[PDB]
């Protein structure tokens, strides 16, 4: 007349900042050891 689930998309951003943090963590962890 005129005028679901959690977002597989909107949530994904968080998964990207996460992955990025983990990657940076790869750098920091690796350089010391």
């Amino acid at each position: 007349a005129k005028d679901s689930a959690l977002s597989l998309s909107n949530v994904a951003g968080v998964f990207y900042i996460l992955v990025g943090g983990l990657g940076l963590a790869m750098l920091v962890a690796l350089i010391e050891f």
Binding site: A5, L6, L8, I17, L18, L22, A25
Partner: protein, 110 residues
Amino acid sequence: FSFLDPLAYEIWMAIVFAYILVSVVLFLVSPRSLSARIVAGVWWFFTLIIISSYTANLAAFLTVERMVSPIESAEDLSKQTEIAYGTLDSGSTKEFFRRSKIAVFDKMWT
């Protein structure tokens, strides 16, 4: 299913990948150096956002269930075409609807 449903299933597979990723990064590294702090930190942010999302989404749906009321009043029933409705083939009821010039009932009869 209502536990796994509020979050998308591909999101659950994704969080599993996030878990194994954090675990293996931890493996590559009770305080441990520096990197363990950025790992645990980013996982903290992540898990906080996820628990918040499950909470909010489940709240929204449980709100929808309580905010949706089926047909109750008659006038309300008259304006919607989704649920069909009717009466007896021959009776005082049908003849009532017919001979009645009252607005709502007139619409219903129409």
